[PDB]
């Protein structure tokens, strides 16, 4: 019978073994001290939805938005990637800043968009994040959805707000429709056309979304875009 009395504080945090973590802290483990991966205990707690451990570590003075890991992200970033709405809610209540950007240039709304976490996208919008917030790459949440979520949501949710459907990202000037064609995201293509996506608007290389469709020799895509003019 493993009783956790042998586990290190990182493994015990991951698994939410609350009393194990608390004994290691009072015995001298600094809640602010990172591990060999430059990850803090708050990060591990957040990405495993350990609500109570999060309260406890913060009460011991853990830094809420401390960057860590190879991707150089806050604990809130981690919870957002993983999809823990309750943890996103909890961390934002302690002052975590959802607009901070990680090492990939993304803030929280983009992380939630690109991993398909529809309820967190809704929540960030309900807390004041702009639906068309541009990340460091010039990507909107709708672009990230078109590119990465091959699914009705979160695209359908995003289109219920006053998005500027024909924006293009900063470096490629690809609209969300461009991204969906690029990615073969057939579910999203119909939603964007139905929401007014311009099939002729050209990116920075002067290719329209129809051009990209024709390029990929995808008969279904070419027909569907052509019939939306």
């Amino acid at each position: 019978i493993d009783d956790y009395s042998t586990w290190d504080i990182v493994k015990a945090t991951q698994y939410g073994i609350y009393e194990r973590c608390r004994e290691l802290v009072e015995a001298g483990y600094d809640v602010r001290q990172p591990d060999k991966e430059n990850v803090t205990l708050l990060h591990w707690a957040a990405i495993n939805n350990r609500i109570d451990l999060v309260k406890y570590y913060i009460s011991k003075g853990a830094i809420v938005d401390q960057l860590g890991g190879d991707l150089n992200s806050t604990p809130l970033h981690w919870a957002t990637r993983q999809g823990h709405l309750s943890m996103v809610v909890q961390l934002m209540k302690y002052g975590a800043d959802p607009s901070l950007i990680d090492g990939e240039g993304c803030s929280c709304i983009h992380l939630a968009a690109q991993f398909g976490h529809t309820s967190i996208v809704a929540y960030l919008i309900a807390k004041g994040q702009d639906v068309d917030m541009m990340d460091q790459n010039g990507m909107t949440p709708l672009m990230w959805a078109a590119y990465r979520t091959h699914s009705v949501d979160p695209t359908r949710l995003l289109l219920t707000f006053n998005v500027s459907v024909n924006l293009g990202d900063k470096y490629h000037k690809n609209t969300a429709l461009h991204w969906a064609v690029l990615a073969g995201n057939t579910t999203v293509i119909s939603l964007l056309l139905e929401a007014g996506a311009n099939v002729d608007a050209q990116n920075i290389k002067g290719e329209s979304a129809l051009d990209l469709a024709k390029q990929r020799k995808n008969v279904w895509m070419i027909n569907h875009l052509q019939e939306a003019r």
Binding site: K11, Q14, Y15, E37, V39, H43, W44, I47, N48, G69, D70, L71, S73, H77, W78, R81, Q82, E104
Partner: peptide, 10 residues
Amino acid sequence: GVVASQPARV
């Protein structure tokens, strides 16, 4: 399972 690996590049 629990998450015991840090987020990585795609």
